[PDB]
Scaffold this active site. Structure first.
Site, short mmCIF file in Angstrom:
data_model
loop_
_atom_site.label_atom_id
_atom_site.label_comp_id
_atom_site.label_asym_id
_atom_site.label_seq_id
_atom_site.Cartn_x
_atom_site.Cartn_y
_atom_site.Cartn_z
N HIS A 1 2.61 14.05 15.26
CA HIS A 1 3.74 13.94 14.34
C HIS A 1 3.61 12.58 13.66
CE1 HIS A 1 7.65 14.10 12.53
NE2 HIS A 1 8.11 13.07 13.23
N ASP B 1 7.53 18.54 10.53
CA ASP B 1 6.44 18.55 9.56
C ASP B 1 6.17 19.98 9.09
OD1 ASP B 1 5.46 15.64 10.28
OD2 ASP B 1 5.69 16.75 12.16
N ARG C 1 5.20 5.08 12.95
CA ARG C 1 5.81 5.51 14.21
C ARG C 1 5.08 4.97 15.43
NH1 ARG C 1 5.37 9.60 10.70
NH2 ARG C 1 7.15 10.94 10.15
N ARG D 1 8.90 20.89 6.74
CA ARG D 1 8.68 20.22 5.45
C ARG D 1 7.63 20.94 4.64
NH1 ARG D 1 9.03 14.24 8.36
NH2 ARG D 1 11.24 13.90 7.80
#
Ligand SMILES: NC(=O)c1ccc[n+]([C@@H]2O[C@H](COP(=O)([O-])OP(=O)(O)OC[C@H]3O[C@@H](n4cnc5c(N)ncnc54)[C@H](O)[C@@H]3O)[C@@H](O)[C@H]2O)c1
Ligand SMILES: NC(=O)c1ccc[n+]([C@@H]2O[C@H](COP(=O)([O-])OP(=O)(O)OC[C@H]3O[C@@H](n4cnc5c(N)ncnc54)[C@H](O)[C@@H]3O)[C@@H](O)[C@H]2O)c1
Lengths: 310, 310, 310, 309
Positions: free
Chosen positions: D172, D145, D85, D148
């Site tokens: 993140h 996250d 990212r 998850r």
């Protein structure tokens, strides 16, 4: 309760997503020969669940379908360059040849919900292959066309779509029949209601709305190549009706013994939808002109099926 | 986003509960002569919200109706076993002479939603006392009788009531008119539908359904003393239509300049309901027999209103 | 799916109404010795259904409970003048002695959900009489007190109640235990969260919130004579957890082999709730003071059960 | 109430879908440079609404953001398979220099909700460009996250994720911090709960859950090309919190004056989210190992951002 979805492309995954976010079922299983694809969608969807409802979402094989009360078939293969419609049909018809028996082996009591286009033919295919009673195998049919009909009519009349009870019958496509004659708005025959609103449904007003329904998927395809969000939600609503034994009316596709004088053809009519699939089929009141149009639609479908070998 | 309820008794509190369960409004204020009762109802319902939808329910004075988009009037005596709703008129007309101006003073822009019986004439009384435009004062009217008709037919046919399209017009009471002529399921006239379902509706079956609808309140009152769950949900639904400017079509009561030849009378007809109350009124074409029944019903109401000078 | 409710008083009928408006189950059956009472509530709530979700609501006998996945026992008998609360308990225990076996005769796989007060002792009674495993008989317990604790903490901290994870344990009543020590807000230990918010909780803050929880029911009783809306939605929520196999945590009452040194007693602890009832019981982290309070609550319930003969 | 979404690709459209399905807002407007894309998505979703909740979904220009209470920024490139990212930074910063001024011109009072990766730096970028108070610019941060982490724990324990309380802080991304130390179910520390349930979380088990959370996006991207269903729902939830002034506590990204000793960095901590955005930030006590890791995370983001900056 468990729902299965065979085919983890955009349509199957969007259906699974709508099922999850609406908490329709406790378990949702995705099946796809491209294992990594089904896994990736199952993982992406699972991760949405803490923001909504608890749903065990995962990817698996036919065995994972055991206990499913409904299985969605969104297993249409990707069209090859210069393949043409009829070739695609065959390939898809052959996919269904492998899929149907394996689904029913794992989930012998499942209602099958066909999404694969052309839905009417594919519903016929699934029915024939299944060896199940006619009501057990249902296609999405004109569910979206019917909703779109109501939405446009609602805008025209300045009322809520939920007040407009109007149907689209026959083929999900060019020969679909908008039923104006027996449509109603909040219990009022449509003609009396339109007048009450300073609207005469001119033949030109109806033509406008008709084209609006027929052409709806066109801008979506043109703009992004395929539709899935709309149909995903529609299928999730049908799944809900099955799982909850709703006995509500939907315009879905199913094998039909006789309609408008045509015999043994799969097409859309208003049907009561519940636990075993279609609980009963309604044959709406039609004007002579609408009946003639339904007859033509059924004839088109019958011939298209017969040509496939069905 | 704010709704007021005047009269926090059985009907008023069931309405608040349904509003909360259905997540209709962010704020619900309960105004009762008995502040402690209203406060108790408010706290009781507040303890329900963690298991439904976030809603601020509280108890205040009339002044606290400030800012309400809709105010439900549910104050007044209810009929006992041997009594018709019309026999409550004089007692409850005195109550509205106190309630109505107090609501108008605190919330002059509020749509008035009348529940107090006899609901049609009390609607007339509220309209007269309010000085508001005719469409801003709405009575629940036959919204509950229509629901009963649909539910009873649903039970008879084994179809969800959402798909059973039938309504009741005229008085919410003994002279009400069940509109069999246009009743419909899946676009098929009701009787033809029932026929095809092997559940034909004989004149005796219809008489039975009719008594089931017409005497519903009486049976419920006999069994448990009062009715409130049904009307509670119906009022919550009308409140939603107003708050969201839904323009949904409901059979509710309002001042009617002319209907079936009778002048200046409040009774139920199919109407478009939105942010400012009634947005439009339909005068459906009835069977000859229904049309005459509606005339007698409008005549009954006009007579009852006239006796008090309304 | 089907849910039964034995006892069609205010608690039973509010539960049925919440179930219906929230569309938790397709079938809701009310059973009461007072057949006309049950019938009246069943009709009244059925008439609400066209405004929300299709639900077959009716009144029946125990036989009608066949296939019910959860049955709510709200069967408390009405107190006679001069009758002791102990004498009232005796009569309710005899009632349960009849109800429990007749329910299980008809729906052998049903989860029993006890609503009758005192809920912990009545849970013990239902469990002993059932002959089922301990996880199959659950009482509403402290579900509403837990929610109330969270609401008051949320208000104090200026946060959403859904972000507050705190529990009330033990007796549903005067000996309730508020668990301050291991409470969390959005993943953060309560003390750190409050501290960060610049709102350290003083003894005075904790005392006020404690009273807010511990006397919440009394306040509603004093204003309207009984509570029912709150617990109706709470019970409806527990039924939903059971029917959807949620496996979510709730502070509900169930027979507990050992808690805080006390043996074989029914009281509330955080429990994982799904298809078969409780799927696991959690014993939260407690401070010495919280543990001492829980032991006392357990002792009190144990002595009451024993006194009654259970 | 009205919500806007800038960037009508997979994330933006899935967000619109989730908003429609959850009935979050009465009005959702989609804005994209590719107007035909936005229009196709809006019409596709509009057709879903009859089967869920009344929502007016449509595609418009930046001007059409007018009156939006919240605007989701999901414009820019996503990571290719095997791409981090942070590698999107230079490109997406350029995108935001165009996007951000245009959004505030049409809807000056909108809370900005940043999805574009790398979210934390992009949140920092949006903040700097906006001129707005720090609380009005919120990044989805570790909200996904955290979800998850809860979901994977839910599958391990057989408990609804609603009842699994665990979260992730910091970047993140690869340096994110799973906060095992305060994870709880029903008031019992997670590890003790798991043991008592007859399914002890071994070090090997915890390491697999870590990989499960930490590398989730790389797997999903390898398998189907992009992630969007997870973040779509998480963004719809954050939008709901803003529109409803919920004051819910979420692990979201925002400009942070100091954290773990590092100054002026945007990253995720537990925050109160309501109308007007972040209402407050909590700095939880962490194990020594968690705090060192959070520090590392902050240092990494700050240094990556330094390049402009
Ligand atoms: N479909 C319908 O429209 C329908 C259905 C059922 C009942 N109702 C009617 O609704 C009315 C209420 O019935 P109910 O069972 O709820 O009665 P309750 O249960 O007796 O409710 C009445 C409440 O109104 C309060 N009140 C009286 N005057 C007041 C005033 N001036 N200001 C504020 N509060 C005032 C009373 O204190 C009382 O609490 C009756 O007229 C009944 O016939 C209508
Ligand atoms: N948890 C998270 O924060 C999370 C999760 C998944 C994806 N993402 C990120 O969200 C972003 C979007 O992903 P995507 O899959 O939707 O990509 P797409 O699918 O490539 O969506 C991007 C869209 O932005 C549009 N766009 C670019 N510049 C624009 C401008 N100036 N104005 C309006 N529209 C403009 C493009 O036309 C394109 O349609 C990516 O950066 C991706 O990494 C974040």
């Amino acid at each position: 309760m468990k729902v299965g979805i065979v085919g983890s492309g955009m349509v199957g995954s969007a259906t699974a997503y709508a099922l999850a976010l609406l908490g329709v079922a406790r378990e949702v299983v995705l099946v796809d020969l491209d294992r990594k694809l089904a896994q990736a969608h199952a993982e992406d969807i699972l991760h949405a669940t803490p923001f909504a409802h608890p749903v065990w979402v995962w990817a698996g094989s036919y065995g994972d379908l055991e206990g499913a009360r409904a299985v969605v078939l969104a297993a249409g293969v990707a069209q090859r360059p210069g393949e043409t419609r009829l070739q695609l049909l065959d390939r898809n018809a052959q996919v269904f040849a492998q899929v149907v028996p394996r689904v029913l082996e794992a989930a012998p009591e499942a209602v099958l919900l066909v999404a694969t286009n052309p839905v009417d033919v594919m519903t016929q295919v699934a029915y024939a292959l299944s060896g199940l009673p006619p009501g057990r195998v249902v296609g999405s049919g004109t569910i979206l066309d019917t909703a779109r009909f109501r939405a446009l009519l609602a805008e025209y009349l300045r009322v809520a779509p939920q007040s407009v009870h109007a149907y689209v019958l026959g083929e999900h496509g060019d020969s679909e029949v908008l039923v104006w004659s027996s449509a109603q708005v909040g219990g009022v025959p449509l003609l009396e209601f339109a007048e009450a609103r300073g609207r005469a449904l001119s033949p030109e007003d109806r033509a406008r709305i008709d084209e609006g329904v027929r052409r709806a998927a066109y801008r979506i395809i043109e703009g992004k190549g395929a539709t899935y969000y709309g149909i995903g939600a529609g299928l999730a609503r049908l799944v809900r009706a099955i799982l909850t034994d709703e006995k509500g009316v939907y315009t879905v596709s199913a094998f039909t013994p006789e309609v408008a004088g045509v015999l043994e053809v799969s097409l859309s009519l208003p049907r009561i939808l519940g636990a075993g699939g279609v609980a009963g089929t309604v044959y709406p009141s039609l004007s002579p002109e609408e009946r003639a149009a339904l007859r033509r639609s059924a004839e088109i479908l019958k011939e298209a099926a017969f040509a496939l070998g069905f």
